[PDB]
Design an enzyme around this catalytic site. Sequence first.
Site, PDB file in Angstrom:
ATOM      1  N   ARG A 153     -60.370-107.503  47.077  1.00 15.35           N
ATOM      2  CA  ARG A 153     -60.563-108.109  45.530  1.00 15.35           C
ATOM      3  C   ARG A 153     -59.301-107.175  44.800  1.00 15.35           C
ATOM      4  O   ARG A 153     -58.772-107.673  43.882  1.00 15.35           O
ATOM      5  CB  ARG A 153     -61.899-107.815  44.981  1.00 15.35           C
ATOM      6  CG  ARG A 153     -62.845-108.346  45.764  1.00 15.35           C
ATOM      7  CD  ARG A 153     -64.049-108.565  45.025  1.00 15.35           C
ATOM      8  NE  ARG A 153     -63.872-109.721  44.216  1.00 15.35           N
ATOM      9  CZ  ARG A 153     -64.964-109.771  42.942  1.00 15.35           C
ATOM     10  NH1 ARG A 153     -65.614-108.766  42.361  1.00 15.35           N
ATOM     11  NH2 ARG A 153     -64.623-111.036  42.192  1.00 15.35           N
ATOM     12  N   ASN A 181     -60.822-103.784  35.682  1.00 15.91           N
ATOM     13  CA  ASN A 181     -60.834-103.339  37.087  1.00 15.91           C
ATOM     14  C   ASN A 181     -59.822-104.034  38.055  1.00 15.91           C
ATOM     15  O   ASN A 181     -59.236-105.125  37.521  1.00 15.91           O
ATOM     16  CB  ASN A 181     -62.128-103.196  37.805  1.00 15.91           C
ATOM     17  CG  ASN A 181     -63.123-102.592  37.032  1.00 15.91           C
ATOM     18  OD1 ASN A 181     -63.289-101.432  36.931  1.00 15.91           O
ATOM     19  ND2 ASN A 181     -63.939-103.596  36.144  1.00 15.91           N
ATOM     20  N   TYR A 182     -59.732-103.874  39.343  1.00 16.86           N
ATOM     21  CA  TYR A 182     -59.084-104.553  40.367  1.00 16.86           C
ATOM     22  C   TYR A 182     -57.339-104.522  40.331  1.00 16.86           C
ATOM     23  O   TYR A 182     -56.858-104.265  41.117  1.00 16.86           O
ATOM     24  CB  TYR A 182     -59.348-106.044  40.478  1.00 16.86           C
ATOM     25  CG  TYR A 182     -60.852-106.216  40.602  1.00 16.86           C
ATOM     26  CD1 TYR A 182     -61.630-106.671  39.646  1.00 16.86           C
ATOM     27  CD2 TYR A 182     -61.491-105.925  41.933  1.00 16.86           C
ATOM     28  CE1 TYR A 182     -63.064-106.558  39.818  1.00 16.86           C
ATOM     29  CE2 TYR A 182     -62.979-106.016  41.942  1.00 16.86           C
ATOM     30  CZ  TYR A 182     -63.758-106.535  40.735  1.00 16.86           C
ATOM     31  OH  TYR A 182     -64.937-106.447  41.127  1.00 16.86           O
ATOM     32  N   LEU A 183     -56.956-104.622  38.690  1.00 16.25           N
ATOM     33  CA  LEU A 183     -55.569-104.305  38.689  1.00 16.25           C
ATOM     34  C   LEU A 183     -54.866-103.330  38.663  1.00 16.25           C
ATOM     35  O   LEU A 183     -55.358-102.127  37.874  1.00 16.25           O
ATOM     36  CB  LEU A 183     -55.006-105.266  37.306  1.00 16.25           C
ATOM     37  CG  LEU A 183     -55.576-106.552  37.253  1.00 16.25           C
ATOM     38  CD1 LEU A 183     -55.407-106.993  35.734  1.00 16.25           C
ATOM     39  CD2 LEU A 183     -54.751-107.498  37.882  1.00 16.25           C
ATOM     40  N   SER A 194     -53.901-107.729  42.636  1.00 12.24           N
ATOM     41  CA  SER A 194     -52.466-106.990  42.061  1.00 12.24           C
ATOM     42  C   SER A 194     -51.125-107.600  42.576  1.00 12.24           C
ATOM     43  O   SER A 194     -50.334-107.600  41.466  1.00 12.24           O
ATOM     44  CB  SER A 194     -52.717-105.562  42.576  1.00 12.24           C
ATOM     45  OG  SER A 194     -53.769-105.073  41.823  1.00 12.24           O
TER      46      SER A 194
END
Length: 471
Positions: free
Chosen positions: A388, A428-430, A393
Amino acid sequence: WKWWEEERYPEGIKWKFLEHKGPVFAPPYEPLPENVKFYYDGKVMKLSPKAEEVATFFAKMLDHEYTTKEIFRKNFFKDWRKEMTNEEKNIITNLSKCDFTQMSQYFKAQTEARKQMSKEEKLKIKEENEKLLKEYGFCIMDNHKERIANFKIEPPGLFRGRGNHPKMGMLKRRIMPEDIIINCSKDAKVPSPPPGHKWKEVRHDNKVTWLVSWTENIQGSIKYIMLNPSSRIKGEKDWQKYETARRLKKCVDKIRNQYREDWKSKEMKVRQRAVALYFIDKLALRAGNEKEEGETADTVGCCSLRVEHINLHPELDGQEYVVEFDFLGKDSIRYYNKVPVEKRVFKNLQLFMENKQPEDDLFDRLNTGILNKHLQDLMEGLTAKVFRTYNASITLQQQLKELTAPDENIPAKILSYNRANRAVSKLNYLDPRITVAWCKKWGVPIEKIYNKTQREKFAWAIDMADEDYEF
DNA sequence: AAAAAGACT
DNA sequence: GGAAAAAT
């Protein structure tokens, strides 16, 4: 102050020294004045300071979709036969014969009474609630002092669980000083327990990120008090979370070819493994661990998926081999996607739901454990969640490379950031270093995107990303 | 080996 | 993260 330039403490111990001021409870329950009521079955009933306390929590949520919820009411009748006396619960046989109306004009007037407080009366006690933030809000550590994220203990109330949670509306009782477990070094100035009460225990465990922790009476899970996302300990872990995604980049080519091969396997658990991995790669799905049926709501992730959750069509909307995912994920948010797959996968999927009743599992010989145990062999630090973070990204790198016009003006580039940010959750995640790599390759001020609060968490990324940072 | 219990979007 | 309270 900069922590990323200093020497990094290896695996094991999470802090050298710690000394915190201690928690803050909810100021001891303030009783109901004479003028308030409680009307029961034609007549009127009186309330004990314990039942009067629980009363105010149902008052704080009258015109909510929760009150018109059957399961919520069922649990309020149960949890309330405990929070009162024996004489009071002697006559009461139905909640339908109650009136919280006089407390409802009161609760509402009390909200509007703060909207009446002057431009001096709003600072009289508003400065006092900030005297806390200075005293109990910061804590000393190795280098400098770090800010604690949630010093104020969870005030008693009710359980606002999502969707169709079987334990919503239960008595989430007041945490007493004796349920608390303080954590800090045995050569520090230990927090003085509130007048007359003891703590549960005190541990000098340096392998944990927490300062204080207690237990939840409802489900039995332990809740902690940690630091601000600005901190070394809260940041180095997110830095590592992104660094984990970096070490994946090269090993990815091999993972896809790896599972793609596992589709034409010879065994059950192996062919099962790969399909799941395909979804978690593509669909950006979560894993879904073993849930407690009767304890929590019925949600499902990838491993916990059932037969009734997928519908399969050979040709749909001009596309071949389509899978229709229909389920409720985290926070009971319905996931729906008519996703086109590859031939082999469709064929593999067909073979599972092959003599199976709808209420049973989809992935027979498979759970999260077997999935993550596999992923670990493939690389160090790799878990299901990393996908994820990776997928989300590497997109932004390729997106932040073509959508920006060279001879452009001001917002004609920020209109491209949000375009790339639309290409799917934001927070989040990035990886912030891609967003900052772009801000120096072109030259856009950080204060324009990320505010003061956000420029606090990405503080490490600001000072360690140049005009050529490729993921 | 599996279950429970601990911890850290 | 999500909900909900607070900053013409």
